[PDB]
Structure formats: structure tokens, C-alpha cells
Write a protein that binds this ligand. Sequence first.
Ligand SMILES: [Mn+2]
Ligand SMILES: [Mn+2]
Ligand SMILES: [Mn+2]
Ligand SMILES: [Mn+2]
Ligand code: NA
Length: 344
Amino acid sequence: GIQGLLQFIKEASEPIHVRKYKGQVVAVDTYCWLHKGAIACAEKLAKGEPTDRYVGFCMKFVNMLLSHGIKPILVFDGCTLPSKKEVERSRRERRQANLLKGKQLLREGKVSEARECFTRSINITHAMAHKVIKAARSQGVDCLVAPYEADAQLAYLNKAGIVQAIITEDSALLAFGCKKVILKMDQFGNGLEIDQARLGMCRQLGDVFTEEKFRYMCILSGCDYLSSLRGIGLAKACKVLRLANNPDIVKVIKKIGHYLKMNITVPEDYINGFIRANNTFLYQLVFDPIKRKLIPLNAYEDDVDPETLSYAGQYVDDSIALQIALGNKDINTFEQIDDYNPDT
DNA sequence: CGCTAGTCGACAT
DNA sequence: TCGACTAGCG
Ligand SMILES: [Mn+2]
Ligand SMILES: [Mn+2]
Ligand SMILES: [Mn+2]
Ligand SMILES: [Mn+2]
Ligand code: NA
């Protein structure tokens, strides 16, 4: 959701081929592939007609990784995150709008236009993802459903040393503190890598290459958890953090118009939103696959009360988190759609 | 120049 | 699940 982030830090990126990670473990932001896969068969998906074309699309990529001796872990988005509800609403509204329009264009005969609308009405469901999971597993590929956003789960797997890199199209994964992200990776393995440790290569960040400041910059520029103040993008957010001296980020935001020589009113709820968004990048719940439990992405500090962090994912019993992670529990019916047992 | 909001692009015949 | 582009605005 950090619009314009990749161009802005392009200096820190390197063209690569995934051969680099041969014999290592890479995690995949699989909903990216799913959304790409679904475009080919949008019409049938919109009409409710049966399709599994998207499964073969994802499997091309999976197969390619395996051929180069990469051990992929496919990660899937799970339950809805309240911090993202506004964005979830606008996406839902847009899908609905386009689906209706396509249908009306079918009673018109304009199949060309109707196709353009359907393709923008695509909704990726757990049922669709679960078909990819079965395909993957049958080829011995580890799959994991995040309890909430795949984003934080990926970050967690990268930070824990479980995977060495993350394949995704979402550059905001860097604000979650991923070490290595591989973007724009094509079907042949060519892609664009950004390492957190090379963010200092990026001249226009100044000293906003440190984890905490980089996160603040991303949030300030406007992210999925929190719309920016009007007139603030990456460059001005970066500028505020460069020029600001005070460590207390709240006191800096309150006087943000000062650092920028702009008339910017900062509403009281914006500070609250900013804190919430910060806490969401930091403490969004993930599933530790080794101990098989729900944990915050980072350990709680001595400044956060975990009781107040519902918006970052509510805890559920670990036995339930397990069934979700294995893909057994449908997200929504919360009923068993499968009974895969990794032990046996 | 930097930011915004709208648009449109991803598939693959 | 997202990103790239662009014309217009300050
Ligand atoms: Mn849940
Ligand atoms: Mn979703
Ligand atoms: Mn994201
Ligand atoms: Mn995501
Ligand atoms: Na912004």
C-alpha cells in the first residue's frame, strides 16, 4: 500500500535470478499469484462457472522454483484484519460495482467491455486458495495460511531465519521488517531483489534507512492502515524524519507542518491512527509454525498494552490457529473443509 | 518538483 | 493481492 515506494528506493534494488537461492528456502506471497492467475478466467469466475485455471498458473511458478532446487513455502492470507477494514471496504465496493456493470453489458452484447469489468471484479476466496494448497501439497510443497495478513507472516518467517527471502509484489513488506524481498519475479525466475541492509544505498532516504524510521516514513506517506495527511507523500514524509531531531515521533507529527513549512492541521484521531498503524506493522498476529502457536510479529515492548491491540488480530485458541494454518478450517464458515495431518 | 485521484494493468491467442 | 502511469494542482 505504500504507493510509489519501489521507484523511491530503486537504488537499493538489484536485478536477479532466483538461482541465487538454490538449496535455500523462499516464502511466497501466494495471493499475488492467485490474483494474477484469476485474470485469465475472470468471466467464468464472475458467472459462477466452474474453473481451476488459476491453479495451473500458480503451479507453473511453483514448478519453476522447484526445478532450480528452491524449497518454496506458500503463504496465504487468512482472516480479515480490522486495521485494514476501510481498504477492505473500498475494494469490495469496487468489485461489486464492476461485477454489476459487466452483467449489464452482457444484456447489451458488449462482451469486450463486459470482460474488462469482470476482470476487475475478481474476488480471491479461501476455496480458490485451498485448491492451490491441495495441488502444492501433492507435489510435496509446504503451505501455510497466516491467521491474518500473509504480509506479517512472511516477515515473521524471514526474521526467524525460517526462509531466506520473500517473493511478493508488495513493497510495503519492507515496513514489516523483512530482510529480503524479491519483486516482479517472472515465470522464468527473473526478478528484482531489495535487501533491507542495502537501503542505505538509496541516496534520497538520508538516514531514514533504519528500521524504525523507515516504518514511520511508510506510515506517514499513507498506507493501507492509515491515510496520509493531505499533501504528504514519501518525499515529504522522508524529509520530516530527516529534519526531525526529537525521538518522540508523536511530538514530531504534531508539529509536522513546521518541518515542511506548510499549513498542516493534525487532527487528534490522526495521532491515534498513527499509533494504531505503527502497532499493526509491529504486533500483527502470526503463527509460529515450530511451536505451533499465535504470537505477535514482534515481542511486546514496555510501551504497549496487548489488551488494546484488537485491531491487529484477536487471539484464538492455538488448536484453532493450527487448523487455520494447515488450511483445514475455512476462514468464514470456520468449519472443517479438510483434515490434512502434517504429522501422519 | 511533489502529491493526488483517477485509470488501467496483471492473463495470454 | 497489488503496482504503473498521468494530468492537474500547489
Ligand atoms: Mn481467525
Ligand atoms: Mn481478502
Ligand atoms: Mn500489504
Ligand atoms: Mn498482502
Ligand atoms: Na500520501
